[PDB]
């Protein structure tokens, strides 16, 4: 018979199966729709989750209970050393999907890039990409001309530089970033002129911009149904334990449905969150990356004692409003919004008032080590 009291199901069926992700790297399922009018431009970037802090900003929301008052907001730091563009891949549409026409490489690729092709680089002869790169320029131009003539989707192979990060990993994360913009004539030259040079984050993204984040969530091994799906605990008197679903299906159908929550893997899931606002794009060069015009102090984004479980951010970074899936050191792929947003939050120009760099280990009271030593005075 019917349920005495209805209530919504537990968990979303749209994230099934809750299995382990294939890869640690976030994979873009789809890029934003191509707009012919806009000039050619990159669409995605890669960084690493360094940690998070909080900032103070002045709200400019009229008719809100906050408005003129200053607000503390949590923000994630994603270290983004410049990516290196190394390849061009052209796609053409077929009734069977997108088909690669060919990929064209640059004349030189980093050892960091070549490491990604090896499982045992240290014992290898490192012979990858050694004799396919000295191909004559005539064939290169022929391949680009055929891509121009036939292809309709262009992507640039680009890779990260983990040597510029505190990561133990040495092999680069490589991925293709789709170029959206003018015709293929313009797309090809836009990528060719950047076929070897570094790609900084500032080229891809602007401050105060909404972006999507693609990353693999934090893993938790196998978890019970109570933690995995949020089912209600059974009463204390239950004979064979209470941390389980009581009825896992009616008599008929004489099967267990796939919609029934069960124990299994929790975390390490691929996720694509939308609408994370970039609060600041901090640069490697400047010494006031974490300073605001209302603070005028000389400090960088890394909190005293370093980002816990990550290290020091010595490169470009972006301060992302809110949280992002994944642990520290997790590679986060930032993607341009699928459709540009004209909402008030999307178009808002945030004015950062203060960025906290106190120790994230324990409860830090100081913003800088100099401030700490000045406060305590001389010691033994």
């Amino acid at each position: 018979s019917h349920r005495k009291f209805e209530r919504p199901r537990h968990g979303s069926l749209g994230f099934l199966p809750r299995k382990r992700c294939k890869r640690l790297r976030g994979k873009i399922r789809s890029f934003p729709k191509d707009d012919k009018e806009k000039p050619p431009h990159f669409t995605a970037f890669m960084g690493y989750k360094a940690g998070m802090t909080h900032i103070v900003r002045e709200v400019d929301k009229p008719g809100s209970k906050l408005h003129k008052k200053e607000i503390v907001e949590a923000c994630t730091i994603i270290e983004c050393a410049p990516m290196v563009v190394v390849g061009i891949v052209g796609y053409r549409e077929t009734p069977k999907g997108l088909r690669i026409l060919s990929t064209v490489w640059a004349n030189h690729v980093s050892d960091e890039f070549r490491r990604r092709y090896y499982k045992n680089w240290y014992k290898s002869e490192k012979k990858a990409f050694t004799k396919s790169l000295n191909v004559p320029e005539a064939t290169k131009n022929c391949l680009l001309k055929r891509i121009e003539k036939y292809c309709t989707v262009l992507r640039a192979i680009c890779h990260t530089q983990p040597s510029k990060t505190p990561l133990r990993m040495k092999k680069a994360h490589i991925m293709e970033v789709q170029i959206n913009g003018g015709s293929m004539k313009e797309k090809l030259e836009f990528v060719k002129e950047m076929l070897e040079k570094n790609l900084p984050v500032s080229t891809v993204f602007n401050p105060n911009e909404m972006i999507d984040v693609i990353s693999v969530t934090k893993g938790h091994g196998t978890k019970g149904v109570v933690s995995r799906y949020g089912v209600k605990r059974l009463p204390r008197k239950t004979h064979r334990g209470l941390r389980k679903v009581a009825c896992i299906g009616a008599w008929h159908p004489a099967r267990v449905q796939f919609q029934i929550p069960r124990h299994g893997q929790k975390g390490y899931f691929h996720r694509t969150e939308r609408n994370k606002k970039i609060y600041r794009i901090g640069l490697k060069t400047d010494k006031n990356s974490a300073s605001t015009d209302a603070d005028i102090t000389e400090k960088k984004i890394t909190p005293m004692g370093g980002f816990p479980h990550y290290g020091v951010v010595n490169e470009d970074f972006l301060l992302l409003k809110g949280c992002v899936a994944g642990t520290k050191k997790r590679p986060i792929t930032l993607r341009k919004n699928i459709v540009p947003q004209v909402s008030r939050d999307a178009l808002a120009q945030v004015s950062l008032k203060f960025i906290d760099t106190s120790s994230k280990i324990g409860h830090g009271r100081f913003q800088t080590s100099e401030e700490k030593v000045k406060y305590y005075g001389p010691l033994k």
Partner: protein, 62 residues
């Protein structure tokens, strides 16, 4: 940037860190951290805690 003063200790509280507490009389107190909040709630006087700035002042070793 403008920081407040902790009530149990003299430490500076930067924005987004501490916690406030209002007594019966409407008197408001600010505490930097959970330790200070706990000690104030158990009503331990900072003057008798060796590591506190109040103790340092009362023993004249600033």
């Amino acid at each position: 940037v403008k920081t407040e003063a902790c009530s149990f200790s003299e430490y500076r509280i930067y924005p987004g860190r501490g916690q406030k507490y209002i007594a019966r009389d409407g008197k408001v107190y600010f505490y930097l951290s959970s330790k200070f909040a706990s000690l104030a709630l158990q009503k331990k006087k900072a003057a008798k805690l060796r590591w506190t700035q109040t103790w340092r002042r009362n023993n004249k070793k600033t």
